Amino acid sequence: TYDALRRQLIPSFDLLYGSAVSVVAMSVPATARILDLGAGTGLLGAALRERLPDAELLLQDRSQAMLEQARQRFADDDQVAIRVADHLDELPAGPFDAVVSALSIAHLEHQDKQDLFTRIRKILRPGGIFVNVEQVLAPTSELEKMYDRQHEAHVLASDTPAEEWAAGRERMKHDIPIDVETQIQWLRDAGFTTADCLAKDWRFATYAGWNGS
Ligand SMILES: Nc1ncnc2c1ncn2[C@@H]1O[C@H](CSCC[C@H](N)C(=O)O)[C@@H](O)[C@H]1O
């Protein structure tokens, strides 16, 4: 399955996606309105639905091909809507209790990331939460080599098909990651009153900002 390959490619998948679901559930009500930016096949959205059966999910992505898989995943779910939109396009009108994203925002230029965080806060209710599960750069080129070693170590320990890891490395060449503490400070710059790294496995981290808390 697609879901098994993602666990193979992503170190501490269960910790990082689990941490995103847990922090949302401890920050918003059961009936929360949640925006999922770069939802893809809707993997984080599925994890949220499992925890929050009464939550309204809006799944957003630039790729109709990716959303086709999200449509199938959520075939019979009447509290899930799907919007075709770029992160750089106007966000859907607030208010949202939570805006979430997994492995998407790293594709934007740094200035576009900072602008996006500001635009996200504007569509969040007071006390609202932004959560990102993100590929993060090491703070030095030497530590980046160690980050890469640990990613490789997980992929080989997971018995990952060679051709799928090759495709994975190729996709990462088109990412523009930065270190977690830099993008956490960008949340503070954007006007989020608290921001924190909840969980981290070297190259992959779950962080959140709160709009008043
Ligand atoms: N500028 C942009 N605007 C919207 N979606 C974007 C984007 N750049 C990349 N994406 C989307 O971001 C996704 C990255 S793959 C991650 C998919 C899913 N969130 C998961 O965790 O499994 C892809 O679906 C890609 O189409």
Author numbering: 17 to 229
What does the published report state?
Here, we characterize the O-methyltransferases BelI and CysG, which catalyze the initial step of β-lactone formation. Employing techniques such as crystallography, computational analysis, mutagenesis, and activity assays, we identified a His-His-Asp (HHD) motif in the active sites of the two enzymes, which is crucial for binding a catalytically active calcium ion. As expected, BelI as well as CysGΔN16 adopt the class I methyltransferase Rossmann fold, characterized by a core domain of a seven-stranded β-sheet flanked by α-helices. The HHD-motif enables regiospecific C1-carboxy group methylation of their respective malic substrates.
Due to the high crystallization tendency of CysGΔN16, subsequent mutagenesis experiments were focused on this variant. Therefore, we conducted structure-based mutagenesis by introducing non-conservative alanine residues in the HHD motif to further explore the metal-binding site. In contrast, the CysGfl-H122A variant remained active across diverse metal ions but was inactivated by EDTA. Therefore, His122 is involved in metal stabilization without affecting the interaction between protein and substrate.
